Amino acid sequence: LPPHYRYGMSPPGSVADKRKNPPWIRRRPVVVEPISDEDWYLFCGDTVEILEGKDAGKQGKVVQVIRQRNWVVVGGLNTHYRYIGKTMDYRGTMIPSEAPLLHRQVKLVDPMDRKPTEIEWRFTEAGERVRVSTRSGRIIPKPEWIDGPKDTSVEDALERTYVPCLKTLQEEVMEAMGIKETRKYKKVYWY
Amino acid sequence: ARGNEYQPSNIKRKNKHGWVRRLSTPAGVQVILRRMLKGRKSLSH
Amino acid sequence: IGIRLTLPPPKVVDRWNEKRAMFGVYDNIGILGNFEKHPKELIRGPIWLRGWKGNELQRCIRKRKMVGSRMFADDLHNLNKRIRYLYKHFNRHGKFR
Amino acid sequence: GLEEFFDDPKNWGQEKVKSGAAWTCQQLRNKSNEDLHKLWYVLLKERNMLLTLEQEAKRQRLPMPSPERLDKVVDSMDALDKVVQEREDALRLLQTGQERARPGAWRRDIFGRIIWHKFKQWVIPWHLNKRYNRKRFFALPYVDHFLRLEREKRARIKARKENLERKKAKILLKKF
Amino acid sequence: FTPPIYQPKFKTEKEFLACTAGIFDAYVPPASQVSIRRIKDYDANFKIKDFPEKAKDIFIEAHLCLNNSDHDRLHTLVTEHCFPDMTWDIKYKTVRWSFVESLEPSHVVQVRCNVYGQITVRMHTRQTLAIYDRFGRLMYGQEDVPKDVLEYVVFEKQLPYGSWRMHTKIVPPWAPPKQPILKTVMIPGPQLKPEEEYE
Amino acid sequence: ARNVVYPLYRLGGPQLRVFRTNFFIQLVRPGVAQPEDTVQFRIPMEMTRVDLRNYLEGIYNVPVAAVRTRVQHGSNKRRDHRNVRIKKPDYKVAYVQLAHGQTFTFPDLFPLYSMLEEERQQRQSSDPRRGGVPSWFGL
Amino acid sequence: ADRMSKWTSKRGPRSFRGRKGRGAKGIGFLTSGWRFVQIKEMVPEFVVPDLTGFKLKPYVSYLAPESEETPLTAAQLFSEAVAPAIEKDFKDNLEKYGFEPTQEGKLFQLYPRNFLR
RNA sequence: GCUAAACCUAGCCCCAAACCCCACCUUACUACCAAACCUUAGCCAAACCAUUUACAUAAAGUAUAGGCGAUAGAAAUUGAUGGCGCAAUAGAUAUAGUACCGCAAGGGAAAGAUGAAAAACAAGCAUAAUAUAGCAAGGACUA
RNA sequence: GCUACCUAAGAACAGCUAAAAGAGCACACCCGUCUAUGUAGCAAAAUAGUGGGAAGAUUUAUAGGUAGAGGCGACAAACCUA
RNA sequence: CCUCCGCAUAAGCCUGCGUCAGCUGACAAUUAACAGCCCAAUAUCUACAAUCAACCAACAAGUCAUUAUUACCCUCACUGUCAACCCAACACAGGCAUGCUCAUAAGGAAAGGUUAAAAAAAGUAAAAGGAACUCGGCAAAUCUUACCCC
Numbered sequence A: 001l002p003p004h005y006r007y008g009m010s011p012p013g014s015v016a017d018k019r020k021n022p023p024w025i026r027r028r029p030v031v032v033e034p035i036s037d038e039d040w041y042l043f044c045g046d047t048v049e050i051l052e053g054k055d056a057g058k059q060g061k062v063v064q065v066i067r068q069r070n071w072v073v074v075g076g077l078n079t080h081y082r083y084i085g086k087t088m089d090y091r092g093t094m095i096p097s098e099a100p101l102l103h104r105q106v107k108l109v110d111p112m113d114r115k116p117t118e119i120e121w122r123f124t125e126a127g128e129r130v131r132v133s134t135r136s137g138r139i140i141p142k143p144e145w146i147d148g149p150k151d152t153s154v155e156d157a158l159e160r161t162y163v164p165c166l167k168t169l170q171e172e173v174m175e176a177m178g179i180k181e182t183r184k185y186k187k188v189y190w191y
Numbered sequence B: 001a002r003g004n005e006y007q008p009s010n011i012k013r014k015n016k017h018g019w020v021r022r023l024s025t026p027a028g029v030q031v032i033l034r035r036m037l038k039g040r041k042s043l044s045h
Numbered sequence C: 001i002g003i004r005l006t007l008p009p010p011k012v013v014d015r016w017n018e019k020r021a022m023f024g025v026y027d028n029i030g031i032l033g034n035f036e037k038h039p040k041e042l043i044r045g046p047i048w049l050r051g052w053k054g055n056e057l058q059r060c061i062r063k064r065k066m067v068g069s070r071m072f073a074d075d076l077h078n079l080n081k082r083i084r085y086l087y088k089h090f091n092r093h094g095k096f097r
Numbered sequence D: 001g002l003e004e005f006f007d008d009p010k011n012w013g014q015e016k017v018k019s020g021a022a023w024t025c026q027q028l029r030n031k032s033n034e035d036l037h038k039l040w041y042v043l044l045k046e047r048n049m050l051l052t053l054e055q056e057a058k059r060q061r062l063p064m065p066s067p068e069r070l071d072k073v074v075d076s077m078d079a080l081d082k083v084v085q086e087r088e089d090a091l092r093l094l095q096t097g098q099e100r101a102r103p104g105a106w107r108r109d110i111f112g113r114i115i116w117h118k119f120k121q122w123v124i125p126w127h128l129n130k131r132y133n134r135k136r137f138f139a140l141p142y143v144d145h146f147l148r149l150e151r152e153k154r155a156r157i158k159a160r161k162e163n164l165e166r167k168k169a170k171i172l173l174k175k176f
Numbered sequence E: 001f002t003p004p005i006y007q008p009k010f011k012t013e014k015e016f017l018a019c020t021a022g023i024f025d026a027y028v029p030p031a032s033q034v035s036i037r038r039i040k041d042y043d044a045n046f047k048i049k050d051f052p053e054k055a056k057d058i059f060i061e062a063h064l065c066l067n068n069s070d071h072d073r074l075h076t077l078v079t080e081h082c083f084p085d086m087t088w089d090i091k092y093k094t095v096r097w098s099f100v101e102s103l104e105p106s107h108v109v110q111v112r113c114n115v116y117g118q119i120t121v122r123m124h125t126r127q128t129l130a131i132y133d134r135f136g137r138l139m140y141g142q143e144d145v146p147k148d149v150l151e152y153v154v155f156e157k158q159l160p161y162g163s164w165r166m167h168t169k170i171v172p173p174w175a176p177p178k179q180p181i182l183k184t185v186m187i188p189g190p191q192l193k194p195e196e197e198y199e
Numbered sequence F: 001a002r003n004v005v006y007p008l009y010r011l012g013g014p015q016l017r018v019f020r021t022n023f024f025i026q027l028v029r030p031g032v033a034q035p036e037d038t039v040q041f042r043i044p045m046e047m048t049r050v051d052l053r054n055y056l057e058g059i060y061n062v063p064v065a066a067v068r069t070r071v072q073h074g075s076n077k078r079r080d081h082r083n084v085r086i087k088k089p090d091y092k093v094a095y096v097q098l099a100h101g102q103t104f105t106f107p108d109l110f111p112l113y114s115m116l117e118e119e120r121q122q123r124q125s126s127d128p129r130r131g132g133v134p135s136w137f138g139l
Numbered sequence G: 001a002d003r004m005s006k007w008t009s010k011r012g013p014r015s016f017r018g019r020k021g022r023g024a025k026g027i028g029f030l031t032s033g034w035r036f037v038q039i040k041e042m043v044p045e046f047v048v049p050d051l052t053g054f055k056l057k058p059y060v061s062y063l064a065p066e067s068e069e070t071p072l073t074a075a076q077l078f079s080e081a082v083a084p085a086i087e088k089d090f091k092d093n094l095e096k097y098g099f100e101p102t103q104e105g106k107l108f109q110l111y112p113r114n115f116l117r
Numbered sequence H: 001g002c003u004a005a006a007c008c009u010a011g012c013c014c015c016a017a018a019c020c021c022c023a024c025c026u027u028a029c030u031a032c033c034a035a036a037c038c039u040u041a042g043c044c045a046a047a048c049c050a051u052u053u054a055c056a057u058a059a060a061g062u063a064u065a066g067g068c069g070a071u072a073g074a075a076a077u078u079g080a081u082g083g084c085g086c087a088a089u090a091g092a093u094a095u096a097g098u099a100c101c102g103c104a105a106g107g108g109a110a111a112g113a114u115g116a117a118a119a120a121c122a123a124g125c126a127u128a129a130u131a132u133a134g135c136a137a138g139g140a141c142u143a
Numbered sequence I: 001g002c003u004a005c006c007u008a009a010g011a012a013c014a015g016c017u018a019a020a021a022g023a024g025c026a027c028a029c030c031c032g033u034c035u036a037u038g039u040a041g042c043a044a045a046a047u048a049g050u051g052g053g054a055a056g057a058u059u060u061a062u063a064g065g066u067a068g069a070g071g072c073g074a075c076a077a078a079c080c081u082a
Numbered sequence J: 001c002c003u004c005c006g007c008a009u010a011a012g013c014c015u016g017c018g019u020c021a022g023c024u025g026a027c028a029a030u031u032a033a034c035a036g037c038c039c040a041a042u043a044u045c046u047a048c049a050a051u052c053a054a055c056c057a058a059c060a061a062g063u064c065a066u067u068a069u070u071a072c073c074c075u076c077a078c079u080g081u082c083a084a085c086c087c088a089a090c091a092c093a094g095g096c097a098u099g100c101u102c103a104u105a106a107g108g109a110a111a112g113g114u115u116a117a118a119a120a121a122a123g124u125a126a127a128a129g130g131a132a133c134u135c136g137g138c139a140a141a142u143c144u145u146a147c148c149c150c
């Protein structure tokens, strides 16, 4: 991506993203606090509570996470309305579009208390790394085929046919295929 | 009458301003070094 | 049109940040500490003008003398040229004599 | 046959073609050298078919059906190549102790830069090779000035980058 | 002689969801306990006998919001499928919609049902209109004289935080023609090209 | 194979063998009318016509009668926003004439929204008689 | 006058265009009369195996279990190939176990490598 | 009301600390054939020019040198945590040693600005050409 | 890569007259006497006509060479990238 | 109606009026026989031009050759192939080597429409005279003598 590329709601490679951020744009970079990867505590699917703005207090489910801008999109929450399909004649249709929310503007929700909770990345002997709520304890869990004609069966893919040997693939294949070569490689000079 | 002093010919171009000729003498090596220091994309012609 | 059409963002200055609050402390280190340390030793900056002052020509001469060997090639060339030019200016040009 | 350059006829025109997963390096490491040799050509035929599909899609100005399988095939071939290279490197280290398959040497070129010159195959010795003798692997004293200049340019770039990073960090601290 | 000077070339080679699509089962004006249960099991609190009052309140408040162009409240008061109908044609023109006492009590008609509720309420109320232009000159309806309005209003609901909002008004084919327009209109005939001839 | 140093051959030496071929080719529909026995391929630049013949005869068992090659120049005229020329890659085109009277022809490859469509159906375009008056109101 | 465009065989005069190539590896040599003699051994021979009966496929079912990558090392290969024989013979001249003092004499010399891929 | 106007950060400046796969010398980026080391000069000052003319502190601008003149100039001895910086004609030339210019060495640019989310007032003119006479204004005047 | 001169190995010179020509008339080609136009032009030296040479000390394509207190020069202080 | 040209090769440039859909993006294309890309050594050979090469004629003296031995079975790889094109800042009246076409079978369009003022450029015609113009017969028209200076 171009340096100081402004991450937006559209994915960084879509038609809309290319339209909004052509190669020549030089907009001012957006200042984002440096949340370390080991400190990020919002994940796709987490139930969260909005602290600020319209729909404050309401709890929804994170639909997307634009980590590069400290963003979490709560499905059907923090929504404005936009027209989709509006053509020269048709007015289009109104659609609720969510706006990104900052992790500072959003807090996780206890699995059962259904209330905002501050979280810590405390190690547990079983769950080596897992979130733990501070004000009321308890661990917030991390949320979340037919073989085709050109797909190997699992047993075939796992069959360990390898026999550790001191033979290169070339000579091993030569032996397997019966190719016979008697000529000796004449020595060459390297420099 | 004037203006068309450039009669292109790749043989002359390479034999006059080529990498081999620039390296042929210490002065041309310094020419290439100056271009590299300046960051020229085209070090030799 | 050389005038901005909006008020610039407000500039908040914390007059009581540690730097401003403790500014000047130990300026009297000498007279109040048996003169073990001269106040100029509190000066932090370029090695060639720590506790010393002079015009541009003197500053350039001191820089060349004290860190000339450690200067980059083109920076040192520029310093030598500047010293030469300043010598010429101060010794051959001016209203008075 | 040439039909192997095209997908199964039933898949022609399908908006989406269901595909498995690209071979992983760990999965490939369990296979024999013969098995990897055969899988290499299996994947090569699949890659040729997918590249043909991509080119024909470009020709017809239509989206390629399920382009992700091309990336899957490329990744699988890369993994197989990596596994073979790992085996070859281990065997070479055991039998000769050489970490590099191709001979080479650290040499100072005519420009004074230290490079890893990779040796080439010749029929005659180097002292007789005329063109090799024409090539120069030493830097005369006039190159030291330019070496210092390049070093100082690099130092300036590094200093600018570091100062910019520190200033950005200070700005971030002020903001938060 | 002095050679000519060329300027740089660049200077001269610069160049320049929470809705549904319509009605699941259209009610045709002159056995929904399954849908009533299908909404009760998901809502846990609801009263059909009390719904008509809330529906009328929402209707009147949404129209009052139209009066002031309170689109922020209209968004929560009507469905997204209805909002463009509510607000599109009325842009750049003031409306003086007002409500006066109803004629017969509003009552539910029928209800049907990732899952969206749906309630049809018949209202026979009395209302007033005065739609002006950008320039404040009346173009539809007297502001004082009220009219009797028979409407079949369909509400929809999202089934977690959604509420009951106007989804669509069903106009029966037998409904009386609406109020006549004030300004005369023209409907041009086929703009024939030279080769074409009128038929 | 490409991007690999070929073991130098001296007289009487062993045959040069490549086990894991690095070349990947494309079969491309000709842009012009071609004989029924001719197949057009896009090839890596480092592949010879002999290499292509052996490749097709071994991997695909295609009886090849003749091979011809030409290097197609890629346009270097398109310029980016910085006025820097964008180079379309040069490529290699191979015409392969099949043997045994075999014939080949390029196969004929390539032989929410519901809500949008239904709302478009239910547009209810304003009638001219309404004269721009919003028709939503029931009065 | 074009310094930036890559130098190819399409640019110079007849001699330049003939002399410069496209990276294709040589196959033979040129004799008197510009007659090209092609050496068969110089032509890469594609060692294509018999794919009949092969069970592997270009793709793998997603049902396959995930595993941890363990890049093969010289120590691991030695343990898995030589260590058993060494132990069995010690409990009871390294060429017996596989080690070769010199790569010379081998068709596939490991260093300097003299085989393709 | 048009052309347009503005903006804040991209970066830069000075310091401190710290020492930093393949191809390619043949026509470079082309797989493969029997020899380096050597005083700088000049501008310029002397009002020309010719000898001559600079490249820690203190001693000291002292001893000395010098068409003894312009000027040059020791030694003995002494001990030695950042920004009253710039903020897109500025700060690096830099968005870039790119575009472009030159055969080559080499020269060398310009510019961007919305939003939390886009998956929402210069000049010049026009409104509105013009009335006898005049450095175009001043005193004025109901005008 | 222009131009001055040179080196290697090439190419061109219709037709007529005279015969073996640094001959004559006159194409191609080279040059640029005079006139007019143009003079920010088609052109940073051109166009039209007219004119000199046009088998020779001729013209010319290709590669190479001589480099600045130097080169080269049938000396015009000419030319050596306007 | 014009034909300066034109078609190829060379050199040069490098996709630069092919298709599609909106100059821009995509897609396509130049297929070797033509041309380039050569030669195993060691010694040893070679006086007698070309000029239709025969008389003849010369001078400026000139472009073309092997042998004797020893080695030597793999044969058709690679690269150029497009264009309305290059050097002149330009769709520049200029420069641009060679072979054929010696006016063309090839290639092109001097007039955007109107009026027919001055001045200006080019061209045609002119009563009588025929250099009286002018620095000068410059230019134009004709097809013209004799003599000086260098």
Ligand SMILES: Nc1nc2c(ncn2[C@@H]2O[C@H](COP(=O)(O)OP(=O)(O)OP(=O)(O)O)[C@@H](O)[C@H]2O)c(=O)[nH]1
Pocket: D163, D166, H015, H016, H017, H081, H082
């Ligand atoms: N004066 C000055 N101080 C600097 C500069 N760069 C860094 N510093 C100082 O370095 C100190 C340490 O910087 P930090 O970032 O806190 O720590 P750090 O990374 O261990 O520091 P470094 O070892 O200097 O790289 C601070 O007091 C900075 O102000 C510089 O350019 N100038």
Ligand SMILES: [Mg+2]
Pocket: B007
């Ligand atoms: Mg020339």
Ligand SMILES: [Mg+2]
Pocket: F069, F070
């Ligand atoms: Mg070819």
Ligand SMILES: [Mg+2]
Pocket: H045, H046
């Ligand atoms: Mg002087």
Ligand SMILES: [Mg+2]
Pocket: none
């Ligand atoms: Mg700048």
Ligand SMILES: [Mg+2]
Pocket: none
């Ligand atoms: Mg104004």
Ligand SMILES: [Mg+2]
Pocket: none
């Ligand atoms: Mg003749």
Ligand SMILES: [Mg+2]
Pocket: I023
């Ligand atoms: Mg003559």
Ligand SMILES: [Mg+2]
Pocket: none
């Ligand atoms: Mg001469």
Ligand SMILES: [Mg+2]
Pocket: I075
């Ligand atoms: Mg003279």
Ligand SMILES: [Mg+2]
Pocket: I077
């Ligand atoms: Mg003179």
Ligand SMILES: [Mg+2]
Pocket: none
């Ligand atoms: Mg000049």
Ligand SMILES: [Mg+2]
Pocket: J109
């Ligand atoms: Mg015309």
Ligand SMILES: [Mg+2]
Pocket: none
């Ligand atoms: Mg006209």
Ligand SMILES: [Mg+2]
Pocket: J126
């Ligand atoms: Mg007359």
Ligand SMILES: [Mg+2]
Pocket: none
């Ligand atoms: Mg007379």
